[PDB]
């Protein structure tokens, strides 16, 4: 139950720096006061991040780092898939106050998918039909997410932080805890973002090597990119 729109809002994307953000726990192993070197997919330090202020179909690549410095839980939904139609399986995620609800099948999306709020919210018109599927899963503020798809497994890492700075990303370090895992194998190459009724930062992941420090309580407090400059390599 959706139609087209006339206010074709297209704000060109700006570019910003990444600083030292985009670090997550690679595994579920406790380590105390140790420097561990690991090779995996991370967001390189001091990279270029695409700032968006409608929403285009951005390619997924290997993984995606998605940040939103929003107020009062604006950013809600996520769409993943290859063709985003009834021809191929599609993935939809809706974030709520408690947790995220996930559905995996071919929902038929239109040009302007949005959830809609009624003033007590009751509206759902992102798609039109869904024939067959099996997997449904139910479980001021800067929200950081990392989305990965490795060998038939969909991984979502999340972190919430309070920030007061307005213009750019905070200059601090905070590891990302593992949040959600799905044992589903579906090819995904593109993803989108749901509209509401709004600025966000997007970055890509690359395979490289990092050095991580674990304190006495098993929390990551420092990370070093090996292949950045001669001092870091040393």
């Amino acid at each position: 139950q959706c139609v087209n729109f006339t206010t074709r809002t297209q704000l060109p994307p700006a570019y910003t720096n990444s600083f030292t953000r985009g670090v997550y726990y690679p595994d579920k192993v406790f380590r105390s006061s140790v420097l561990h070197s690991t090779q995996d997919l991370f967001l390189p330090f001091f990279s270029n991040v695409t700032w968006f202020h409608a929403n285009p179909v951005l390619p997924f690549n290997d993984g995606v780092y998605f940040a939103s410095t929003e107020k009062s839980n604006i950013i809600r939904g996520w769409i993943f898939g290859t063709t985003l139609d009834s021809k191929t399986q599609s993935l939809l995620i809706v974030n709520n106050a408690t947790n995220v609800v996930i559905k995996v099948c071919e929902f038929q999306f239109c040009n302007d998918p949005f959830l809609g709020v009624y003033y007590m919210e009751s509206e759902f018109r992102v798609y039109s039909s869904a024939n067959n599927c099996t997997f449904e899963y139910v479980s001021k503020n800067l929200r950081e997410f990392v989305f990965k798809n490795i060998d038939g497994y969909f991984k979502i890492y999340s972190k919430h932080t309070p920030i007061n700075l307005v213009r750019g990303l905070p200059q601090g370090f905070s590891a990302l805890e593992p949040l959600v895992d799905l044992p589903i194998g579906i090819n995904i190459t593109r993803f989108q973002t749901l509209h509401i009724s709004a600025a966000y930062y997007v970055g890509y992941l690359q395979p490289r090597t990092f050095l991580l420090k674990y304190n006495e309580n098993g929390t990551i407090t420092d990370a070093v990119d090996c292949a950045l400059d001669p001092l870091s390599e040393t």
Partner: protein, 366 residues
């Protein structure tokens, strides 16, 4: 003597072998069993569909206990073809297909690979390479009606047979002859669908029988559906071997005060060696220590002089010694545990070095 491969031994200390504390028992632990597959709604359904319209259900991502289906004696026919059922609790596949219908008593044998019949050729055909199981049980008290239950229909005529895993519910008028029919029966046109006449007065072989067929699929997606894994009790302060959720190894389990973040499952210190683990049931942090082991040595004053020896266990506390379990006065030293030599409180020159500043000599052995 055997180690030296000689019949004479001169005075000194020699390393013969080594010992280790054997494990006592085995313990395996797994998280609490949950997410059982909904088998009740299939085998206890109010009614089943027709044989030509057999109902299909997909089962994935749940634990399926086949023991309850095995030990039930209410199933008149329980025939598993592809594999022996007893091992489905161990090995498993990625998907399950359940086909439910109702057939006559004499049609039970037709549900098998390499079988032919009206149902086997016009209603449901199974390939010779089919793997799975079939469960058929009488439902005379429910499906059969005193006035004649015609709610079940079966195909009677078709030009060709049915492909494996193919469902056809077409109501096209079968044309046996060459005279076309425009939707009306005639001399050579008959309705392929016939209604069953199940009644309580019908004898054996005519009573309605509910049949459910389970098939297993192993698509490249990871396997998710099979029986639960049993768990055992937990013991402490004993060198045993453990199988904590796939993490297998021996050692002694003690209590630990280390703190884990709520998303880890086990920890390690350095060189990738397990140090602590959290049990998946009570969610507490234990501690793993390798139970004691070490080499042994024999101190002798020479075969020519005497024929008695002393035994030294290197770096082993004098609490777990085990025929030489008592011997003489047992002495505990920093180097290890000494058996067969008494301890004096004098001080002379060193003859056969032992370690940690002490050594023994022959007077008995002191």
């Amino acid at each position: 003597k055997c180690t030296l491969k000689s019949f004479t031994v001169e005075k000194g200390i020699y390393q013969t072998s080594n010992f280790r504390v054997q494990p006592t028992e085995s313990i395996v632990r797994f998280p609490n069993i949950t997410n059982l597959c909904p088998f009740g709604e299939v085998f206890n359904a109010t009614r089943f569909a027709s044989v030509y319209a057999w109902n299909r259900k997909r089962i994935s991502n749940c634990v399926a206990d086949y023991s309850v289906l095995y030990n039930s004696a209410s199933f008149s026919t329980f025939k598993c073809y592809g594999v022996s059922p007893t091992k489905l609790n161990d090995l498993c596949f990625t998907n399950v297909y359940a086909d439910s219908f109702v057939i006559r008593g004499d049609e039970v044998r037709q549900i098998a690979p390499g079988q032919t019949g009206n149902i086997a050729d016009y209603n449901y055909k199974l390939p010779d390479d089919f793997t799975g199981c079939v469960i058929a049980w009488n439902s005379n008290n429910l499906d059969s009606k005193v006035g004649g239950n015609y709610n079940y229909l079966y195909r009677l005529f078709r030009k060709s047979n049915l492909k494996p895993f193919e469902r056809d519910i077409s109501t096209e008028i079968y044309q046996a002859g060459s005279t076309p029919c425009n939707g009306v029966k005639g001399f050579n046109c008959y309705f392929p669908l016939q209604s069953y006449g199940f009644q309580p007065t019908y004898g054996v072989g005519y009573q309605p029988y509910r049949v459910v067929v389970l098939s297993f699929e192993l698509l490249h997606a990871p396997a998710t559906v099979c029986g639960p894994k049993k768990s055992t009790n937990l013991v402490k302060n004993k060198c045993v071997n453990f199988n904590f959720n796939g993490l297998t190894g021996t050692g002694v389990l003690t209590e630990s005060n280390k703190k884990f973040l709520p998303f880890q499952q086990f920890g390690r210190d350095i060189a990738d060696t397990t140090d602590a683990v959290r049990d998946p049931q009570t969610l507490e942090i234990l501690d793993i220590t390798p139970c004691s082991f070490g080499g042994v040595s024999v101190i002798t004053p020479g075969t020519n002089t005497s024929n008695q020896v002393a035994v030294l266990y290197q770096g082993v506390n004098c609490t777990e010694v085990p025929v030489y379990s008592t011997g003489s006065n047992v002495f505990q030293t920093r180097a290890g545990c000494l058996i067969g030599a008494e301890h004096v409180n004098n001080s002379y020159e060193c003859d056969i070095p032992i370690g940690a500043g002490i050594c023994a000599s022959y007077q008995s052995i002191i």
